[PDB]
Design a binder for this molecule. Structure first.
Ligand SMILES: O=C(O)[C@H](O)[C@@H](O)[C@H](O)[C@H](O)CO
Ligand SMILES: O=C(O)[C@H](O)[C@@H](O)[C@H](O)[C@H](O)CO
Ligand SMILES: O=C(O)[C@H](O)[C@@H](O)[C@H](O)[C@H](O)CO
Ligand SMILES: O=C(O)[C@H](O)[C@@H](O)[C@H](O)[C@H](O)CO
Lengths: 447, 447, 447, 447
């Protein structure tokens, strides 16, 4: 089957600052909660950290040449907040801004459209010390950061995302303790989620007030669960799982309220959203589009012992990637249609990829499983476009193998292999396959 | 995840006569349309035929010992019609009956419940010469055959199936020309389908009139298609695909009529069902259960050039078995729920398996992919039971690698490897895995 | 270095009934708590059970031929209680006795001295239903069982052990829930430990009263822990670890009391030993020797969160066997010297071995690591003998790969490989190495 | 288990001049007793010599870059005496001093603290001709050498060691004849040992008088033996073995006397220490710390035929490194605690490593066994620190594979592989593992 994509479909790859930039103390960069987290014994696999990670702070020219050869039209990357404001709240670091100018100018020189993610988890440690996202003052610090970037890069960037994966930032980091700052308190997770939504709304306002170039949105990671049985309880368990990742952040944005059933659920657990007057109006600031991060899908059932959402994932026996996630691409088709509850909004698949740990053998990386994974998901993308949904682009999660939060360098998601001992880049077989798809602008599945 | 099965769940394996019995001219056996078909250049891969195929006519004792060691409770097999009535219409061949007595007694001696499939495609050539299933006289010949078996094996067999895969017998064989007798005429396919339904109804009547032991049903192969787009036409294309395999045969049986939309469809193509007065009443004879044969699932779209049903299957990029079928077990969960339109009837998964061609290496057959396939499908079985559906048992398609109709011996579906050069049996790794599942009566998926 | 052993040193191998006998329902055998445990989802790896396990109930003649060729002088095996008394408390099953007569006569015919373990964890389910070892009536049932064996095998067996690994029977099974019956209650673990000690004392009395042949003892599994730091608390943590395995059972036997510090420890946790008047006097019945089971050694430190004994084992980086136990043979030398607190009693290393999962490749099992392990431990044995300790013999843990409780068949400890699919025995390279050591009666370590 | 190290723990690697510097006749370097020894047929394996050995005389910049990337804080190296004083006793060679200035400045430029070993066995041949260390005039020559280095490198080096492994210099070289000058006379070995102790004391005095920078000590190789039996004689045999390596040199230094029992032992063999008045007072000069070289541990027994110390090492069957040494890290914990007899002095593990001969395969050196070895020994280091002992740092024996005295290039101890045919350096897998440990400052053992 041949799947032709729209003429102006935006093809790309994506990275995040702390995962690839290698110069954590260079040019006045301050420490982030992730430096702190990775530097704590037991928080990240093997004690790995982003001190060097890919060294893209120095090797960006090479990476950009590689992505130029890929035939890609956009590059999603994130800005390291502590490089711009080493204290979070403070005096601007021109050296930090200079770095992004070098990167952005090179991208633009190469016809590659920057797709800027302002917040990709690297909150300056100084702000965390004051309570981090649990403190409304951090909202102010973020707006300052956003403004600085909007003004500095006004006509160089046309695509902006305020936050990347609000669920991970709030719940995975503050309720489950898996990601920095590693807390386990429902109330603080809810506080964090609410404050980042306020920060987001204010930043969009500034974007509009400053007359900044381009479009702006937010990029939540998307969850998709299907019930094991036809029971109302399994159905509810799946609604909770799905809704906390997306609706919890999208309903306030698009409809001016948090999902009542989840508000009630958390209330049962003694937690309440710290909503101040006009917070909801600020959060409802009109956005241009949203980024959607998708990787897997699950079959769940209600289980009172299954975590704070009492939703248990069943191991259905499906084959899994090297990080253990089952691959079932229909989930992408399903959430995209599910999200239509907010209207036929513009959606970019800002992240989609697979952990496949193949290494360099005979000078190549025969990552057939990543090609397989991508192929199945791109079919779903075409399928939704064919259904009339406004899915505008796709960004392969990871141009490069990188520091994969908590997993360390152990889990490879890149289309370009990076030997962390030499920093040597080796484009995988998926890279060359992707090059053909993005350059031809059509995909073909064959037996 | 641990999946506990019901106390009385019936575990088994299945075969078909022409695929495993090796003695096509022995003990007065007459030729079937399949001997004829396989003996024709170009009809079956490599000119393979069932002349010897496994030689189970002679090696049944060994096979039965192997299935006894498997911990299985039932064995589904089919009866070679031309061994009982070498002419189809004629004088009984006691030698043919003796063979099945040897098999059945041994099964019973070993506590293995026979699950008898009367018709598994081996129509005596003599009847085909007279028009085969296109001729109503064949219905009479079949009822005689059924009666003979019912009387001969009265208290030895408690589970009976009249026909196995009516869709393949009618459409694949008479419209698509892929299986014997290899015709390509819509009207004859429809005639065949209708006549086999009449034969089925009459045989159930005889079963009841003779007071024969056990329960009796029919075993259609089940189809499952999901639409590519949300269009009404893709939806219709999938209804046609799904309905021709099951509803076309189940609606007359359970509701007294053929699916009207398919009646109209075929009428558009100039074909009409040869329904005589009381045919529908005969077909509606109450049955005890049905067998369901499931292997794969597809995503289809309407396409006017896509065959007689104008339903095109999209290659979604999913991994496939060695015969090229994509594995997606949810399809089993879906049809089982879909079939509830006929009531919560008793259903046995009379066939489910995968073509995995692994051979003997280091004295074993490391068929991990078959274990994987089975594991995923058994989860769905448990899932439907947990939903309250009366799924009574499961039979792994193929105890032994065998003559795979049209594919020849090239496509292996067995849990026991058969080296066709020596007839040597080598239980695969899936055999030992299955032995544990059927003996423990619970399954466990692990990472 | 050459290590010459004493002229009359007793060399052997060992097994346990439920781990090797394959005929759990044969000849009237009743179910044991282990059949029950293994038949419960989640209790044993992969749902493995002892239903067939080696099939030594039928293949003992082969096994005995193999051990005769090994040059061994003794064979330690256990008696399946539910084969003798299918109800535990009840009427004798002559068929069960006959089996052991076949085994024992063959051993004796081959000049191999039987070393009989009366209790090796297979308590009849019927007794467990009544409270198992938590009920003093079980003590009576055990004495009946012991008497029966003493009278039946009077002049055929000269070495007897009442219980094998009291720590595992009591604490691992009733406090930690890892072994059958799988309970987690300190008090019941203590009850079980005390009742088995009473059963042991009474059985020794009967042995003496009946004038039965040979010597009789008990075979505790031995623990050995060394402190991480020189702190009093780490030292205490190690004393608890060491003492619960051995002193807890040996002090009542040899000195008429339980280790006070452990009595106090458990008292702090609200558990008290159910000591009735004269229980201690019964337990103090003089024994002829003890069997010692040794596998590993650890370095521990005090940790309040480290289980009921608040003793944490440090992962020192030492290489481990395939089941994950570090090899450090000095621990054997240490406990043997430590046990001298009870006098220079007769000690038999009734168990010592390693989990090394090597399989048959090129017709052999190149288990160099098991040879390595054994070699290091046999040096320690010689060392203690050279120090004047009365270490009388050594039995390699496992003649055959077997059902390894909770680990299933996944963990191989045998010197003879068993392909559980064919029951085919393949003596490992360690078997041939051991044959030379036991036949020459001296060991040689070489570079 | 996670082992956190002290904030200021000093991590490093170590080498010795003759083993790595490749330019034995370059820049006026005179010959040492080792050039002479290696140039004699039969003294060193395969006639290997240090003529080129690693060529670090020319490739130091590369090596230093590699150790900078390692994250190391100190580098232990030795000074080639015959490069400074080509005659030993004579006129200074500025070219030789210049080399070390290039090395030291580069180290300092890279934040790597030089740890200078003045004497690492390369005594100028000219002095050996006059009797070498057997002649007190050599003491004077050494003090001149020491002074020169102290004055030349005053503020560039902060850590100094006078002698490296006095036992090897005296006994292995002059009693056993294995190392240069290869003599076999107890009396001369004792003379050498005493004269080097006097040289050491005088050099420390000069260090203090000149007001040189840093701290100064001596680095004996440490021995550790445990008795086979509990006999007084085996115990004595172990005391002799242990004491000759350490106490023989440390007692005069810290307590002002030689171990009396060893004085008596040698007296029995007709040898006496040539102690002149005030020699002991000079030797007792206060030192800042000591370096400890540890590799293995043994189990010994008394044996009158077992060499001059009549101490036989038993082959306990333990796994060995590629040079044949058994690995048993507890020995490090034991000697460190044993050395507390001199007070809780500052101790640096100046050497610890393993001979693992893995080569470059697939572009890497998979030296898992060296990682294993180091991991076990670093646990012991942490353990002693946790016990309150002042263990200040650890230096992995060998940054690079090198000329391994008498073994030649056949025995590899490096963390960086050196292909002696191309001089190409290839950091081993242990290098990358060590980089993580030294950079994180904590170690983790995992299963
Ligand atoms: O939010 C994104 O998800 C994260 O930024 C990535 O850095 C993750 O590593 C990737 O999703 C794979 O888990
Ligand atoms: O009717 C069933 O289809 C047939 O009985 C089998 O013999 C098929 O060959 C099997 O389903 C795989 O194709
Ligand atoms: O108590 C003994 O340990 C048991 O009898 C064995 O059956 C164990 O499985 C074996 O020691 C392996 O650890
Ligand atoms: O005395 C030290 O030991 C030596 O400096 C090294 O050069 C040795 O060769 C190394 O220890 C290997 O044993």
């Amino acid at each position: 089957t041949i799947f032709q994509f729209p003429q102006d479909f935006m093809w790309g790859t994506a990275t995040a600052a702390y995962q690839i930039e290698g110069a954590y103390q260079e040019d006045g960069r301050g420490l982030s909660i992730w430096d702190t987290f990775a530097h704590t014994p037991g928080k990240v696999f093997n004690g790995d950290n982003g001190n060097v990670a890919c060294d893209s702070y120095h090797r960006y020219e090479e990476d950009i040449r590689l992505m130029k050869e890929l035939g890609i039209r956009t590059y999603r990357f994130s800005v390291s907040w502590p490089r711009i404001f080493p204290n979070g709240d403070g005096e601007v670091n021109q050296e930090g801004l200079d770095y992004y100018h070098r990167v952005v100018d090179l991208l633009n020189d190469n016809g590659i459209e920057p797709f800027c993610t302002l917040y990709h988890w690297d909150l300056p440690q100084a702000l965390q010390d004051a309570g981090g996202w649990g403190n409304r003052r951090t909202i102010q610090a973020f707006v300052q950061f956003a403004e600085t970037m909007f003004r500095e890069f006004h006509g160089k960037i046309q695509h902006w995302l305020t936050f990347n994966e609000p669920w991970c930032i709030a719940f995975l980091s503050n309720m489950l303790g898996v990601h920095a700052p590693g807390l386990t308190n429902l109330q603080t997770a809810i506080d964090v989620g609410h404050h980042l939504l306020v920060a987001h709304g204010l930043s969009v306002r500034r974007f509009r007030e400053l007359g900044t170039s381009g479009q702006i949105g937010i990029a939540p990671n998307v969850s998709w669960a299907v019930p094991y049985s036809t029971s109302e309880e399994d159905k509810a368990a799946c609604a909770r799982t799905i809704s906390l990742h997306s609706d919890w952040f999208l309903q306030p944005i698009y409809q001016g309220s948090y999902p009542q059933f989840l508000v009630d659920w958390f209330a049962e657990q003694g937690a309440t959203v710290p909503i101040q007057d006009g917070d909801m109006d600020i959060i409802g600031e009109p956005i241009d589009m949203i980024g959607i991060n998708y990787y897997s899908m699950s079959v769940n059932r209600f289980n009172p012992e299954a975590g704070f959402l009492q939703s248990e994932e069943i191991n259905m026996g499906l084959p899994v990637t090297d990080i253990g996630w089952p691959v079932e691409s229909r989930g992408l088709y399903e959430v995209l249609h599910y999200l239509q509850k907010y209207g036929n909004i513009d959606i970019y698949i800002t992240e989609n990829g697979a952990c496949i740990n193949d290494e360099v053998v005979n000078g190549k990386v025969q990552d057939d499983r990543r090609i397989s994974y991508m192929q199945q998901h791109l079919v779903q993308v075409h399928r939704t476009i064919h259904d009339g949904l406004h899915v505008k682009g796709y960004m392969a999660w990871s141009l490069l193998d990188n520091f994969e939060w908590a997993e360390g360098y152990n889990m490879r998601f890149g289309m370009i292999h990076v030997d962390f001992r030499t920093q040597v880049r080796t484009p995988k077989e998926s890279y060359y396959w992707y090059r053909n798809v993005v350059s031809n602008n059509w995909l073909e599945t064959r037996r």
